[PDB]
Design an enzyme around this catalytic site. Structure first.
Site, mmCIF file in Angstrom:
data_model
loop_
_atom_site.group_PDB
_atom_site.id
_atom_site.type_symbol
_atom_site.label_atom_id
_atom_site.label_comp_id
_atom_site.label_asym_id
_atom_site.label_seq_id
_atom_site.Cartn_x
_atom_site.Cartn_y
_atom_site.Cartn_z
ATOM 1 N N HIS C 53 45.748 34.547 46.225
ATOM 2 C CA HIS C 53 44.320 34.497 46.499
ATOM 3 C C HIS C 53 44.131 34.206 47.980
ATOM 4 O O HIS C 53 45.051 33.725 48.646
ATOM 5 C CB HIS C 53 43.609 33.414 45.683
ATOM 6 C CG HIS C 53 43.502 33.711 44.221
ATOM 7 N ND1 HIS C 53 44.559 33.566 43.352
ATOM 8 C CD2 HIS C 53 42.449 34.111 43.469
ATOM 9 C CE1 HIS C 53 44.171 33.884 42.130
ATOM 10 N NE2 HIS C 53 42.895 34.220 42.174
ATOM 11 N N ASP C 56 44.191 30.509 48.397
ATOM 12 C CA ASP C 56 45.523 29.929 48.266
ATOM 13 C C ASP C 56 46.272 29.945 49.591
ATOM 14 O O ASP C 56 47.106 29.070 49.844
ATOM 15 C CB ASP C 56 46.327 30.682 47.207
ATOM 16 C CG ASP C 56 45.773 30.499 45.814
ATOM 17 O OD1 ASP C 56 44.992 29.549 45.599
ATOM 18 O OD2 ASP C 56 46.122 31.307 44.931
ATOM 19 N N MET C 87 50.589 42.783 45.800
ATOM 20 C CA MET C 87 49.267 42.631 45.212
ATOM 21 C C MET C 87 48.588 41.433 45.857
ATOM 22 O O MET C 87 49.233 40.433 46.177
ATOM 23 C CB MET C 87 49.383 42.499 43.675
ATOM 24 C CG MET C 87 48.102 42.314 42.822
ATOM 25 S SD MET C 87 47.335 40.674 42.691
ATOM 26 C CE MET C 87 48.179 40.011 41.261
ATOM 27 N N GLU C 180 40.822 42.873 35.913
ATOM 28 C CA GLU C 180 41.520 41.986 34.998
ATOM 29 C C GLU C 180 40.554 41.473 33.939
ATOM 30 O O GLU C 180 39.629 40.720 34.276
ATOM 31 C CB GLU C 180 42.136 40.824 35.769
ATOM 32 C CG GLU C 180 42.845 39.794 34.922
ATOM 33 C CD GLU C 180 43.557 38.760 35.767
ATOM 34 O OE1 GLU C 180 43.595 38.920 37.004
ATOM 35 O OE2 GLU C 180 44.064 37.776 35.200
ATOM 36 N N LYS C 182 39.100 39.350 30.557
ATOM 37 C CA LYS C 182 39.196 38.067 29.868
ATOM 38 C C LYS C 182 37.970 37.914 28.973
ATOM 39 O O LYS C 182 36.866 38.277 29.392
ATOM 40 C CB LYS C 182 39.286 36.909 30.866
ATOM 41 C CG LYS C 182 39.925 35.651 30.304
ATOM 42 C CD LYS C 182 39.994 34.542 31.332
ATOM 43 C CE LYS C 182 40.742 33.340 30.785
ATOM 44 N NZ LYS C 182 40.690 32.185 31.719
ATOM 45 N N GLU C 216 46.490 41.029 30.759
ATOM 46 C CA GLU C 216 47.290 39.829 30.568
ATOM 47 C C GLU C 216 47.547 39.626 29.081
ATOM 48 O O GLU C 216 46.663 39.897 28.253
ATOM 49 C CB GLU C 216 46.593 38.599 31.170
ATOM 50 C CG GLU C 216 47.514 37.424 31.436
ATOM 51 C CD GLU C 216 47.026 36.509 32.534
ATOM 52 O OE1 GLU C 216 46.083 36.889 33.248
ATOM 53 O OE2 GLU C 216 47.581 35.402 32.679
ATOM 54 N N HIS C 219 45.398 36.758 27.815
ATOM 55 C CA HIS C 219 43.974 37.080 27.816
ATOM 56 C C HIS C 219 43.631 38.079 26.719
ATOM 57 O O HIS C 219 42.512 38.072 26.199
ATOM 58 C CB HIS C 219 43.548 37.625 29.179
ATOM 59 C CG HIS C 219 43.549 36.606 30.278
ATOM 60 N ND1 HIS C 219 43.115 36.895 31.553
ATOM 61 C CD2 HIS C 219 43.933 35.307 30.299
ATOM 62 C CE1 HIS C 219 43.229 35.820 32.311
ATOM 63 N NE2 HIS C 219 43.730 34.844 31.576
ATOM 64 N N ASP C 244 50.312 41.489 33.976
ATOM 65 C CA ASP C 244 50.495 40.046 34.066
ATOM 66 C C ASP C 244 51.161 39.565 32.787
ATOM 67 O O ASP C 244 50.688 39.873 31.689
ATOM 68 C CB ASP C 244 49.158 39.324 34.267
ATOM 69 C CG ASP C 244 48.794 39.152 35.728
ATOM 70 O OD1 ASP C 244 49.634 39.456 36.598
ATOM 71 O OD2 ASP C 244 47.661 38.709 36.007
ATOM 72 N N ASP C 254 43.028 29.263 27.291
ATOM 73 C CA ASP C 254 44.022 29.962 28.107
ATOM 74 C C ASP C 254 45.118 28.982 28.504
ATOM 75 O O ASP C 254 44.951 28.178 29.423
ATOM 76 C CB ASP C 254 43.368 30.579 29.338
ATOM 77 C CG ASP C 254 44.157 31.748 29.893
ATOM 78 O OD1 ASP C 254 45.029 32.275 29.174
ATOM 79 O OD2 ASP C 254 43.911 32.135 31.054
ATOM 80 N N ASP C 256 48.400 29.826 29.444
ATOM 81 C CA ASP C 256 49.244 30.460 30.473
ATOM 82 C C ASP C 256 50.654 29.861 30.505
ATOM 83 O O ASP C 256 51.100 29.295 31.503
ATOM 84 C CB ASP C 256 48.588 30.419 31.863
ATOM 85 C CG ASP C 256 47.386 31.336 31.970
ATOM 86 O OD1 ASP C 256 47.334 32.343 31.236
ATOM 87 O OD2 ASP C 256 46.495 31.053 32.795
ATOM 88 N N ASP C 286 51.822 35.618 35.694
ATOM 89 C CA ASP C 286 50.660 34.763 35.920
ATOM 90 C C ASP C 286 50.714 33.642 34.888
ATOM 91 O O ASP C 286 50.044 33.668 33.856
ATOM 92 C CB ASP C 286 49.368 35.568 35.833
ATOM 93 C CG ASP C 286 48.146 34.752 36.205
ATOM 94 O OD1 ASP C 286 48.281 33.807 37.008
ATOM 95 O OD2 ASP C 286 47.048 35.056 35.695
#
Ligand SMILES: [Co+2]
Ligand SMILES: [Co+2]
Ligand SMILES: [Co+2]
Ligand SMILES: [Co+2]
Ligand SMILES: [Co+2]
Ligand SMILES: [Co+2]
Ligand SMILES: [Co+2]
Ligand SMILES: [Co+2]
Lengths: 387, 387, 387, 387
Positions: C53, C56, C87, C180, C182, C216, C219, C244, C254, C256, C286
């Site tokens: 990101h 990030d 990516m 993406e 969700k 994902e 997701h 992902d 979620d 993960d 992810d």
């Protein structure tokens, strides 16, 4: 290669292999099976025993001569195969007289008829040699909020279960009762949905030492709960008298797949929990073969359930018998979990200065638990890729 | 128009209205609230009392002078508003020392520190005037199958709860304990997930008359169960000491919406069950305002919870006080559900010929139960469109 | 033993290994990681690239000199490690200015600010060398039915995505976009919840060859759907540009988790589908390490994701390369599934007498499909117990 | 009082009121209904039309004289009642020849037989006067990961739907097709589970203007999604040709309850969305009366569906026609949501300094959205308690 034996206590049901494939959007895809043929093919596959509903063995509205002829043919099949009957159950859900329920119905004569049919099947179960009775509450519930009064329905279920306990106390049998929970299907909300709701119902009865639970992997996976957590709570209560093993792919309808299919890791931890606790009851498979299969697919699924149990038993024994796994178990402080918290006393806990006053929360919080390394060791012992 | 009063026993939490909006994908959207300001605005809205965590009232790692200054300011706010404290709870989930758990941790000093912090908050709760204690097991669980031994963890939870019961027996307080169940979030599988699992844990303790349940509408709707069925089982056991009211839109994360939102029909049958059973405890709202709202939206949601409870109380009283509804209740045989099944005896049931021998299953099966007409009457009394 | 290499295209995220453990009931359990340290430890573990990101890599509200210093330090880390960036994505969910949404907000200046921040991160992503852009709709939804107009929100999302496509067409870059999906968390109902809803949004745009999906496993498992069915529909549409990989234990929040944990059989069929289809994109994880772990547990989970992918790749290749499995595939008529239905024509289908007139429905219905024998062969090739 | 009329376009199904109550744990509780009797009782209740499967009207394996006698009796019933037929569908799920599927089966002759049966029912549907065709993919799926190849199955479904489109193009009819999605039950994972997956399948066909969706409230609530979000995406695509209205109590089996029961707020926002969008198709109720009811309960549920739709239509019109509600809609910036984001251009967006450079994120983030006051106004207009 992973051949089952009758010392492994593998049991099946008559309605499992005798299911004709009638789902509510389709017709039957298979013919009706003989119970003699089912007992002989399950003896050739390597099972230990069979279970039965009363309507699976004797059809509805038949005569006493046809009833004793069916009992004599089933007894001759059990005497020629050497198989046992460890468990029997009753049918209070198929007939349209039980469309509101059995023991908790809105009609007193329907409740008395369900009690009399249950007492007759208990007499047949003790006559055939069973030692565990299962009362599944199939139709005990409602589709709306005002169709049942739940406290009065729990009063009538307590009255019916105390009447069955008084009947087996007065006859002096050695049979014990088991309650099978389910959240829904066929009703919208079935009373006593979980193992904990069944245990809380068990601890309100008058003679609570004769009642236990018969949980199912699929029936606790439609609620989204954890089935080793439920089996470990039922073993901590000391009430696990029977078990049912199948598969389920999440929060949906009751699929009743074969064992190992669905949640393979939860099935692995279930087999590891039963092998570490030493559960010495029957290993019953309440599963359904799919309607796309023939009879060879039915006996292939019945062999695959026992093969998946033996493969998971070998993987759980190889997981627990390993020094690197035991070093990771010592590193994850699960031997310190087995130690008691305060065995020195409440006054010693209140006077111990190292519990609150000189306790370093930062040094206790900056300590890794190392659960992921142990879970990777469990995944490597499950999949067989160990270095 | 539906003005709340302090005789309706409407209580709130400090963490409810003082939530800053920190979800795990975003930052805080609101500033921190004063508890004096929260007590004064909840007194202006018309509430009866407030509840608190220990970390909501006194911040972590502070001095005893700042602790008694916060207690003196909160006591001055309660004395100037006239509000009570009916319930208090402890915080064993926010700090990183409780990342494995509180009472069931893998570290004995962390378990002893959680017990000492619980005993100090029990002393503060009796000093402030609370009569119900709530122990929510937030971090008590695991993310993998080998991270916790569940039978040893239930042994340590039984030991910690018996130590708290021995402490309140030795001090002679009149406070009682409540266990708040949750299936998951933040752990993968939280121990004692349901109300029935909490009741089955309660019936294994040494002094079981001092322990009850504090269920939540949202926490039982993440399991997909029926919350009037759970509240009616908890009232049939006689263990409902406290309740939490919020909203939830199905099997997902814990949303904690306002009351009435989500399952409106299940909230209507919950309010009808509490008004017919006569539950005389506090009406607590454990809800969260959304992070898109300001403080006017926070107090609008806090007014809307009490307005939705008063509207559902009026609709449930108008539903139960109706002659056509009572005629449909007599037609659906729910007065025959309240009658006992066999009050004449087991030998009279076994000798009664009309229960099995002359029982007409076709004439008993060709009888409509008429639940849909009663559910349409309940829907018309809910929506107000009655002819 | 199952050592990963950079030719296997294993990529990770900066927010994956740099997660501090902040769940909404607890505080952070780990310190903040350097991205240089994360790139060097992922190069020592054997990864191929990192994703980021914008928040990030460069913190919020910083200067341009600190921005180019962070870009220069990250570029020096990538030049000394040899890792790529395949990516990049943007952050439109953490700040409280995006509490209603990014591209579909109720404020036009907030929508324009999200578009300008997206264009600046696209310029940074092409400057760092990325070839795939991911736009996750984190806050795009509502908690009530009247908070968003969904048709106008899809109009504004179409306008924002066509503006980003016009910007990359005008600059002439070779980057492509990915959406993406969700279903929920953090909003109550997130717009475009599934892969099919994202594909139906993709086929309404003006330049639909530059837009794909980034699905994902977790997701699509919070919706209760089938992730090989979704990946096979996305590959049948020809729109799978990125993937992902994580884990999920059913319809809940979620989690993960790491790859392989959760649905191991669905992960096995996903790896089998990607290896049979020949997906040549990056293999991105992810995932989130749990907050009970330290940094050694973080890099142990990051090694365990690649080890689980290599073990499932070996098991899927050994499953597909087997003559008994190919005989069961010929017995289950999956080579007749690959044949076309009517390649002779519609008039030949209407004039063919063996399709309706002389078709024997009983002889076609009394034929077993033998799916359970093939599923037992797949379970034996998954667990390694082959005879 | 809320009397339905044939101008409100209320339609029902023959399998809805003619359901005998056969769930997979019980037998039938009601006798089979005459379609003439069902058409006459639905005309006395106030419906507009009826829909039919081919097996609901003409039984399986019958002669052409009995087929034309059933068509003549049904045509005489429609001519004496004045009711229409707006929709017809085919039965590719009840017979055991379709146990693997219809259009996507592993047998080419079974696929050709399903195509020929579909073409014969399309000819009967145009002969009876229908203008919408519904193809529900009931058995199109698998119970394991290796039982279907999903890309080849989507190729055969595309080939079968293009053959049906070529047949209606060659005959020159005015009928249009609709695809009804479902996630599971009876298969484990049904292909095209959602409305978005059906729309993404629709945009890959050769003649995509003749294909739309027929969504169901219950079938999208077993996936846990939002049904006004799905209906608004289908109306934004311009593909909503038909609708099915029932009820569902969460992520479970397909209950198919009456309309209004289950998610009452989602039904209210669905009726508000259809009344604000102006959907001029039929209002079809694909529901099931419960098996505890008689025929008076069946026609009471059929009256209660239309009464709940008229009550929700009046409440949605009273919600939208209110000045305080319009002031809250202006305060929640939903008129600024209807404005375009950048109608001045991409270069004007890149040169506008107030979008990124002088944009105040703190002043834009410290602004309440006031969604809870609008949701409380919607709850007060739903329940009728307006001050
Ligand atoms: Co089952
Ligand atoms: Co069972
Ligand atoms: Co909650
Ligand atoms: Co609570
Ligand atoms: Co995720
Ligand atoms: Co992702
Ligand atoms: Co349905
Ligand atoms: Co339908």
């Amino acid at each position: 290669n992973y051949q089952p034996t009758p010392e492994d206590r593998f049991t099946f049901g008559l309605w499992t292999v005798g299911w004709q494939g009638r789902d509510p959007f389709g017709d039957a895809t298979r013919r009706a099976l003989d119970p003699v043929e089912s007992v002989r093919r399950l003896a050739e596959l390597g099972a230990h025993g069979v279970t039965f509903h009363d309507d699976d063995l004797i059809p509805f509205g038949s005569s006493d001569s046809e009833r004793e002829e069916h009992v004599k043919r089933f007894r001759q099949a059990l005497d020629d195969t050497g198989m046992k009957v460890p468990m029997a159950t009753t049918n209070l859900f198929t007939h349209p007289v039980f469309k509101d329920g059995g023991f908790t119905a809105n009609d007193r004569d329907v409740r008395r008829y369900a009690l009399r049919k249950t007492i007759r099947n208990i007499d047949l179960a003790v006559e055939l040699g069973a030692e565990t009775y299962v009362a599944w509450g199939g139709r005990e519930g409602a589709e709306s909020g005002g169709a049942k009064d739940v406290r009065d329905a729990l009063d009538r279920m307590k009255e019916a279960f105390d009447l069955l306990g008084e009947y087996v106390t007065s006859q002096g049998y050695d049979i014990r009762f088991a309650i099978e929970p389910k959240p829904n299907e066929p009703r919208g909300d079935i009373l006593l949905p979980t193992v904990g709701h069944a245990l809380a119902f068990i601890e309100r009865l008058e003679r609570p030492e004769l009642y236990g639970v018969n949980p199912e992997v699929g029936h606790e996976q439609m609620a989204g709960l954890n089935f080793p957590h439920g089996i470990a709570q039922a073993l901590w209560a000391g009430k696990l008298f029977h078990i049912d093993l199948n598969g389920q792919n999440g929060i949906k309808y009751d699929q009743d797949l074969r064992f190992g299919a669905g949640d393979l890791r939860a099935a692995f931890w279930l087999v590891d929990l039963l092998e570490s606790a030493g559960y010495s009851g029957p290993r019953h498979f309440d599963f359904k073969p799919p309607r796309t299969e023939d009879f060879d697919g039915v006996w292939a699924s019945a062999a695959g359930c026992m093969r998946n149990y033996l493969i998971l038993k070998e993987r759980a024994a190889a997981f627990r018998a390993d020094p690197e796994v035991q070093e990771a178990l010592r590193a994850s402080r699960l031997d310190e979990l087995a130690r008691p918290t305060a065995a020195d006393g409440l006054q010693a806990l209140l006077d111990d200065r190292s519990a609150f006053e000189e306790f370093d929360v930062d040094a206790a919080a900056a300590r890794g638990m190392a659960f992921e390394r142990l879970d990777q060791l469990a995944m490597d012992h499950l999949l067989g890729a160990r270095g």
